[model samples]
Target: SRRRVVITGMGMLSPLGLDVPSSWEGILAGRSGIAPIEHMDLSAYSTRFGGSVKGFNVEEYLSAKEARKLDLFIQYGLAASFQAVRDSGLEVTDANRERIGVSMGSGIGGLTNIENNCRSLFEQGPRRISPFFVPGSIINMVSGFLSIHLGLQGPNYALTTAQTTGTHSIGMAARNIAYGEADVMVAGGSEMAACGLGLGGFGAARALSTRNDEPTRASRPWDRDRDGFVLSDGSGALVLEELEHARARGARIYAELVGFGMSGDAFHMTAPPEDGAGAARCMKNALRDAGLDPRQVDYINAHGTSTPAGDIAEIAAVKSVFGEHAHALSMSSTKSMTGHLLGAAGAVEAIFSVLALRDQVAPPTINLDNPDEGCDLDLVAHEAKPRKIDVALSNSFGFGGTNGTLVFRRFA
Candidate 1:
């Protein structure tokens, strides 16, 4: 028999809000977290604004000295994991600590730290770079810090698959439990690239929208009027527990990790496949792994980055997988509010998908004023909708044509 997995707790730090509830509320209310970028000076970049996580109290969670030693992405990961650990209600001591682990993902782990360290090394000298430079900028530190903090001695690991980073983490974590390597895993992704180099890099690639005059309406996924995605920063974490273990501990059940599928476009490094065939395969394989038909999936939390090609390609892929049910399935892009979180997108969106299943409400895709004609589907835009969802699919396709899809179903 296949091992069943379920999510027990959730935590997030997003441009919309600091916590899951606050963020979800913002999403349902059709609010945009995108605003003028305030974390760093954007005078050098063409896109002067982005969706930045505002009003976060980092000092509350970490000592000033400790926080300074880590990259902002790692800090975001640590803060969100602390919140998830507390919320999970899992008793950690000398007992089952060895059976718990962490799997975190970051697309561009430490872009900000890299820029700083390089600047110091070039201007001052190698010795001028702080001793903590390497550790602070490494992608694996997110899992390392969480393992040490919570005494997770099982399998502390990280994935750096760019956009598919978060979905890969969650899916791989579930596989760990399935194979009996670990009974519980804290899995998700984090990103903090709303800085100078961050914006400049994506802007140069033409990945981010240059709509500086209107930050809020910039991320218009599947809308003909979309310029491009609005770069945003944040973290989201989830507690994935083995079903039998969860039952023994009397854990609160949310949704089951029913399936995960991954694929590669192998077409281009920066552009998505025009046909979205790789994405369709990912979605179909996920449902197949879950032992369900496409018709059973009631919702989709799309990886709609609001980029012109990406938005339409993903919709076309979903249509290929779902056929006639494509129109019936209520789909939305939370990135409309959360902004494009890059590596952390899948993790945050997965949390949203699970919650939507539990709450029976589909969060709205905001700023979808002019929908693309070809991208026709129930893209739940501008308002929350009531729906009793049993199964949902979350899609995450990153650059390099890498694709991942996760399927979750209400635990029956």
Candidate 2:
């Protein structure tokens, strides 16, 4: 039999707030984190707003010298990982350090660093570039640095599947532990892609909302007026352990990771198939993996990025997978408030789903004034809704037609 996996701890750093408590409170209160871009000048871009993580001090988690050597993405991931480890209270000693692992991801790693280094190379001599540039910008360095800092010597991996990076990272980490590769895993994702290239690239593809006049009301998933998804920066981390291992350690169990499924659309590079066939199959596979009936699910943290095609596609996918039960499910896009976290989207939503199960309340899809044609389900729109969530599902689909679904069950 496959070993049971459970989430023992969680950490979040998002536009909504810095830690889980603040973020969750912002989520439940239906507050908007999307705002005008303040980090850089927006005169060059069509989209001028994004969900930027605010008030995050690297000194709180790392030394000043150490912080200087890493990219902002790595810093966010490191901070979140430390928070998760502290919350889990899992000691890494000589006896069990080898049995712990790290699996974190970032869809677009160190865009700011890449842009800066490229500018420096072009404008100034190559010698002027910082020596730590490569290490600070590489995709896998998050996992590498985390493993070294936490003294976790087990399997260490990183993913970069666009928006699906975080979900895939967590799912793959759970698989690693279930197959006896490790007893504990620090799994999540981080993204700090709010740089010039990041914004301009997405804007060039018409993937960003031009609702600069009303940044707070921009990320309106399932709403008729949503122009595009708003880019965001943040990190989220979770501690997943085998059921028996957590029990043996007397760890606080948050929720059981009952199911994980992934699939490829093979249809488009940046757009899902109109029927959402790939997405439907992914969710169905997750339910089967959990040995669960469709009716058992009561909540969904949707991958509703407020994009035109993606929003409708996800609605169709949910309806296709859940049938009549789709109407009964309390589905909401926290993105409506927190915007899209890109690579960290899945991890942040996963944490919110777990919290929904723990609190028995569905977070709202804010700014959903007018629902589109196919979005007729109970969206928990505009305001938070109280409900009994026995099983919650989080959905994430990325640019390369990659899709992932994670099923979380209330721990009794």
Candidate 3:
């Protein structure tokens, strides 16, 4: 028999707030986290605002010296992972050390670090570059550092699939546990994409909103006036334990991870097709994996990045996958408030879905003043919606047309 997996703990670090509760509160209250990019000189960029992590101090999770060796993405992931580990109360004993693993991911691992090292090499010569650059900026180090720090001796891996990074990380970790590779796994995604290079690059691709005059209202998903997604820096982690194992330890269960689905558009580098076929297939696969009918799901945390094509395509995908039931479910893009965390998008949104299941409330899509044409889903617009959310689904659609969906069911 396949083992069942349940979420025992969750943690987050986002521009909206620190940790889970504060972030969730900000989402429910429809507060925007996007702000002016004052730390860097954005004089040359068209898009000047982003969601940078606010008030995050490295010393709280690691020593100042230790923190200096890692990039912001790594530190953010670690801090959130620490919160999850302590939240789970899972100890790394000799017997269970090899049974608990980690799987964290990032879309752009260390943009700031890479840019800095490049400047050092060019201006001050290669001899002056910091030795920690590669080790600190690589994608796998988030898992590596967390494993080394926590003494977790099991499977350790990281994935970088653009925005799908987090969803895939968490989904694969759950699979590892279900297949008996480990009893518990820490999984999620983190990203720091608010750097000058990040903003300039996305701007070059025409992938970011240029609403500098109104930072907070920039990420208006599904709105007719939506321009593009707002880049952000954030991380989120969830501790997943096998159901019987969690019950044996009497751990507090948040939700059961019932299903995961993934797909590729094979059509665009960063755009979804107008028909939304790939996304629909992903959602269908997830529902089938969960043994759920289309109408069974109560809520969805959409991959609504507020882009011109992405938002409408997602609505079309929902209509195709859920049929008329799409209107029955409350679908909202928390990105309207949290901004787009890129690789961390899936993980944090999954966390949001779990919370919606727990609290029986669907978070709102803040700043959704007007819905675009062909965008008629019940978005829980502008305010949180209290509802019966026994089953919640979250999605992440990223560059290269990667699509992932996860289903979480409330645990009675």
Deviating ranges (above 4 Å) for candidate 2: none
- lDDT (10s digit) by residue, model 2, range 341-390: 99999999999999999999999999999999878999999999999899
C-alpha lDDT values of all predictions: 0.88, 0.93, 0.93
Error of 1 at 298 (Å): 0.0
Q: List residue ranges in candidate 3 displaced over 4 A.
A: none
TM-score of each: 0.98, 0.99, 0.99
Decide which is better by TM-score, 1 or 3. Answer: 3
Give residue 337's lDDT in candidate 1 (0 to 100). Answer: 86
Per-residue lDDT for 130 in model 3? 86
- The 10 consecutive residues of candidate 1 with the worst lDDT sum are 37-46
If ranked by lDDT, best first, what sequence of candidates would result? 2, 3, 1
Q: After aligning candidate 1 to the native by TM-score, how far in Å is the CA of 183 from where it should be? A: 0.5
Record all residue pairs in model 3 with backbone atoms less than 3 Å apart, i.e. clashing.
none
Candidate 3, residue 106: how far the Cα is off, in Å: 0.3
Query: Can you write out model 3's per-residue Cα lDDT over 1-412, one digit (the tens) per residue?
Result: 6899999999999988899999989988999999987768899999988898899988999998899999999999998899999899887799899999999999989998988888989999999888999899999998999999989988999999999999999999999999999999999999997777899899999889999999999999999999999998989999999999999899999999999999899989988999889999999999998899989999999999999999999999999988878899999999999899999999899999999999999999988898888778898889999999999999999999999999999998
lDDT at 275, model 1? 74
Over the stretch 134-199, how does candidate 1's per-residue lDDT look in tens digits? 898899998998898778998899998898899999999999998889988999999988767788
